């Protein structure tokens, strides 16, 4: 199995208490059911099937970004050792099964409102003693810490063993073909979130390879022509919502295996991530892997927020680090198209349009986040949109770097 | 994970014998060491903790031992909070016995039931469970400022309490006094108030004390 | 009775002594840090200067220091 996880809470963006409403606690972690492996029950085959627009949570990622804040205020055990309680709320039992109003006669010591508290699955001697049971809380704090170490888009991880796909990993994928990127992260997430599965387990390879192929596609390389072992993701033609992704085992030239171990931490860099069901289901999925395998190594420090420096066990700076790249959906897709255009996939006059098509699309998932941003302030104690300042949108982050990290990953 | 139902699982973190083992005591409990049948699980702890203590006692700089400590360690089905079960009390004392602490009462080279029982008795006696080094399930926090030098792997974290009272050094064993030794009294600074320094005496004094006269 | 301000003094006095903690242990004198909460108590009743005026100061679980304590 795996008995060791290190987390880091969200950052109260220049704000007092944790940016989550009581109305939220009873909107995700409520109903008394275990708020744990629920993160995914708020996503659809796409975006047009969710209440992710003008509403309490105006974003295809506004849910997790909230449930994640709510998790910070109720994770004191892993911080210090005791259970504590934040505003009349504290886990019912030592197993942290769920949340519930403070008892009445034996209330837990009121939590201490502190931002960015590190976490150690050791500071809580009961966790590992029950592992199996509260297994979920692990993979979750992990999903958290991969969004917390970042400020503008979750930071997942990518791999590619120098070997060919693990047979029973080409068989497991060939049964997930038609399935959309959403339902893939689904199985991915749903999987590594119940019963400690050994990192050796088949599924981990499969769901870890499904996070390497998704990336190759997101950067042309692993396209309809140059597939992985036979797979690649086909994105919906921009003009009718290109924010899609479906796995498709083809049979064109197989992108030869890399010359070595290709590891790197990639995170969406522009606010765009917050509303692209594919930029989340994908990233979220790549995180399903890390959750049941500790954490490859230390994520490079360089490009990362101010509250994520030398974050013990997580962030690094020295050798045990892996350069962390951050791409921008538009500056990205543009090259993703150029790649297609080069492999004869499309016409030479069709990419100067494919971009128009998609670029206008990104301009739509832009006047929307800004609207929701200047709709749900932040001083309002809530953070469904997560501040971003009308700027990062164009921000041509690493991008160019990851577009190269994709080629070396699928030579 | 698979043997999590078993009573408890002791494991040697410091250089196991033939490679990392994972001792699992059967459920039964031995008769003899305590009036209250001590579970085989907890007895193994005492027997080992009573080594790390007796070993620290005479371990020297010039000598090289197999393991920097002989104390066992509970890894499953162990209650970390309370301090009732002989095991919990013993465990709590081993996290301290890994620092080099030695028992004032010399622990015999060949522990005998009479002796083991006199230790398992001293352990049960109401007291304060050492709190400098908190307990973990996969790591033994060892004082950095302590003789003990961690093996290698991921089992020893160099945790430093805020204020550990122990300093280092050893003690050369001295033979048992053949007769009651008189002690000249040299005073300290603080002084107790007659009132308090009275009952203090009257709470632990042997009042109706039978005494021989001898010959004047 | 030990009114609020009069605790400021005995605390300010003891505070200036606790400071020298590292030298008390070093030289085996002293006897641990002196907490002012070791000389007081938590009685309750009416506290004044005379029955007449003490009647207008019902204090509950106030902090008083007994004479023999005001001595130590």
């Amino acid at each position: 199995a795996q008995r060791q996880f290190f987390g880091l809470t969200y950052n109260f963006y220049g704000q007092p208490a944790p940016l989550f409403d009581l109305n939220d606690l009873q909107e995700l972690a409520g109903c008394y059911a275990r708020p744990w492996t629920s993160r995914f029950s708020h996503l659809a085959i796409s975006t047009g099937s969710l209440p992710v627009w003008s509403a309490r949570y105006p974003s295809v990622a506004s849910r997790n970004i909230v449930v994640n804040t709510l998790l910070g205020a109720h994770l004191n055990p892993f911080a210090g050792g005791q259970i504590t309680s934040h505003q009349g709320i504290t886990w019912r039992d030592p197993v942290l099964s769920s949340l519930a109003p403070v008892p009445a006669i034996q209330p837990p010591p009121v939590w201490a409102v502190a931002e960015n508290v590190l976490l150690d699955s050791n500071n809580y001697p009961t966790y590992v003693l029950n592992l199996s049971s509260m297994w979920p809380i692990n993979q979750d704090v992990h999903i958290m810490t991969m969004w917390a170490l970042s400020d503008q888009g979750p930071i997942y991880h990518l791999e590619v063993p120098v070997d060919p796909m693990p047979a029973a990993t080409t068989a497991a994928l060939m049964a997930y073909t038609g399935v959309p990127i959403a339902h893939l992260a689904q199985t991915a997430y749903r999987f590594a979130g119940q019963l400690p599965q050994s990192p050796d387990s088949t599924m981990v390879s499969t769901i870890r390879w499904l996070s390497a192929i998704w990336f190759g596609s997101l950067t042309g390389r692993l396209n309809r022509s140059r597939t992985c072992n036979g797979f690649y993701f086909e994105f919906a033609k921009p003009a009718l919502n290109p924010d899609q992704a479906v796995l498709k085992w083809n049979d064109g030239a197989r992108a030869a295996p890399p010359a070595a171990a290709q590891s790197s931490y990639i995170r969406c860099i522009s606010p765009h991530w917050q509303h692209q069901i594919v930029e989340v289901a994908g990233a979220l999925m790549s995180q399903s892997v890390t959750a049941v395998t500790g954490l490859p190594a230390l994520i490079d420090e360089a490009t990362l927020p101010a509250w994520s420096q030398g974050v013990a066990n997580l962030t690094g700076n020295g050798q045990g680090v892996v350069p962390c790249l951050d791409y921008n959906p538009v500056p990205m897709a543009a090259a993703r198209h150029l790649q297609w255009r080069q492999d004869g996939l499309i016409t030479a006059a069709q990419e100067a349009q494919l971009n128009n098509d998609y670029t206008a699309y990104a301009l739509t998932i832009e006047r929307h986040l800004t609207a929701m941003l200047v709709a749900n302030p932040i001083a309002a104690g809530r953070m469904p949109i997560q501040p971003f300042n009308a700027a990062d949108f164009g921000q041509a982050g690493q991008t160019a770097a990851a577009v190269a990290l994709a080629q070396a990953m699928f030579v | 994970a698979n043997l999590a139902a078993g009573p408890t699982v002791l494991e040697h973190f410091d250089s196991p014998t033939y490679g990392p083992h994972l001792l699992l005591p059967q459920t039964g409990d031995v008769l003899g060491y305590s009036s209250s049948l001590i579970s085989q699980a907890a007895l193994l702890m005492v027997e080992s903790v009573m080594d790390a203590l007796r070993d620290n006692a005479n371990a020297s700089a010039s000598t090289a031992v197999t393991r920097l400590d002989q104390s066992y360690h509970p890894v499953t089905s162990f209650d970390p909070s309370t301090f009732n079960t002989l095991l919990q009390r013993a465990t709590n004392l081993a996290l301290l016995a890994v620092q080099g602490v030695q028992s004032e009462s010399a622990i015999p080279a060949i522990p005998t039931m009479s002796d083991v029982r006199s230790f398992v008795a001293r352990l049960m006696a109401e007291g304060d469970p050492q709190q400098w080094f908190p307990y973990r399930v996969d790591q033994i926090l060892y004082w950095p400022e302590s003789p003990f030098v961690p093996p290698i792997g991921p089992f020893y974290a160099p945790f430093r309490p805020v204020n550990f009272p122990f300093t280092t050094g050893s003690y050369t064993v001295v033979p048992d006094a053949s007769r009651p030794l008189r002690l000249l009294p040299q005073y300290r600074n603080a002084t107790i108030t007659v009132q308090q320094a009275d009952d203090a005496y009257e709470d632990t004094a042997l009042s109706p004390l039978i005494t021989t006269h001898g010959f004047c | 009775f030990v009114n609020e301000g009069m605790r400021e003094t005995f605390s300010k006095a003891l505070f200036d002594i606790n400071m020298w903690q590292p030298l008390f242990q070093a030289t085996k004198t002293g006897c641990g840090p002196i907490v002012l909460s070791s000389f007081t108590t938590t009685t309750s009743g009416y506290v004044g200067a005379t029955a007449g005026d003490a009647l207008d100061n019902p204090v509950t679980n106030g902090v008083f220091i007994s004479t023999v304590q005001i001595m130590n």
């Binding site: 210090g80 050792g81 005791q82 500071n123 | 709190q131 400098w132 908190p134 309490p161 805020v162 204020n163 550990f164 009272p165 | 400021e8 605390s11 300010k12 505070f15």
Partner: peptide, 30 residues
């Protein structure tokens, strides 16, 4: 009370030794 504020560096149990002056980026809270 008086003086600088301390907090259990070793967490939960405060043993008179666990406590340490709660200093930080702002200096020490007195």
């Amino acid at each position: 009370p008086t003086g600088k504020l301390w907090r259990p560096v070793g967490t939960s149990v405060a043993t008179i030794d666990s406590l340490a002056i709660v200093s930080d980026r702002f200096g020490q809270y007195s």
